[PDB]
Amino acid sequence: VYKFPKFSKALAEDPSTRRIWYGIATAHDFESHDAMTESKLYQKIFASHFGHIAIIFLWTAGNLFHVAWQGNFEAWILNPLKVRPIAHAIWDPHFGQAAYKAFLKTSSPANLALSGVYEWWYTIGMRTNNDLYQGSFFLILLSSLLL
Amino acid sequence: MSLDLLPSFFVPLVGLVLPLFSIIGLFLYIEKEN
């Protein structure tokens, strides 16, 4: 019932479940935290910005890797108007045989890609599932830099 | 071990084990005292 809202002693003394709920919803309101100065505020915001950019780059790297690994980017290059892009494969134990058959695309059940990443990456000059892997590797390196 | 075994190795791992340990840690942390 203590020590969770480390940034707020008023919440940490709450004997109810409201402390847990308000601890989540006030975690990023740095200006309202206990023992707070402006320098610490700007420094924490700066570090949070770095972590956020790292998260964005990791998300993009994950999209690239999953298109390279479980997608049909190379097949889509040769026939972009008939082949439907694949986002990533599906492994869900709750599937029946009918669901597996219906979601089956090429070798495994997979989700069609509605993000338009296939067309975007094709336009900027990507033609191989090894070009996407290089992008994922580089973006994970950039995320490490930002962290 | 082929690459197609990775989903069956990772999806249960992440989607069940990570919730369990994360719940353990979060409950322990939010139920601490001083």
């Binding site: 972590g51 790292a54 890797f65 892997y133 590797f137 994970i140 490490s144 | 690459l3």
Partner: peptide, 30 residues
């Protein structure tokens, strides 16, 4: 089709990015 080595080293590099993330997470304090 990417190889096992390609996926494995990407997983290893992802682990390194994870240790860098907790270091940033712990440095942003409890």
């Amino acid at each position: 089709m990417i190889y096992d080595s390609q996926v494995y080293i990407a997983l290893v590099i992802a682990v390194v990015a994870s240790v860098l993330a907790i270091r940033l997470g712990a440095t942003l304090y409890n």
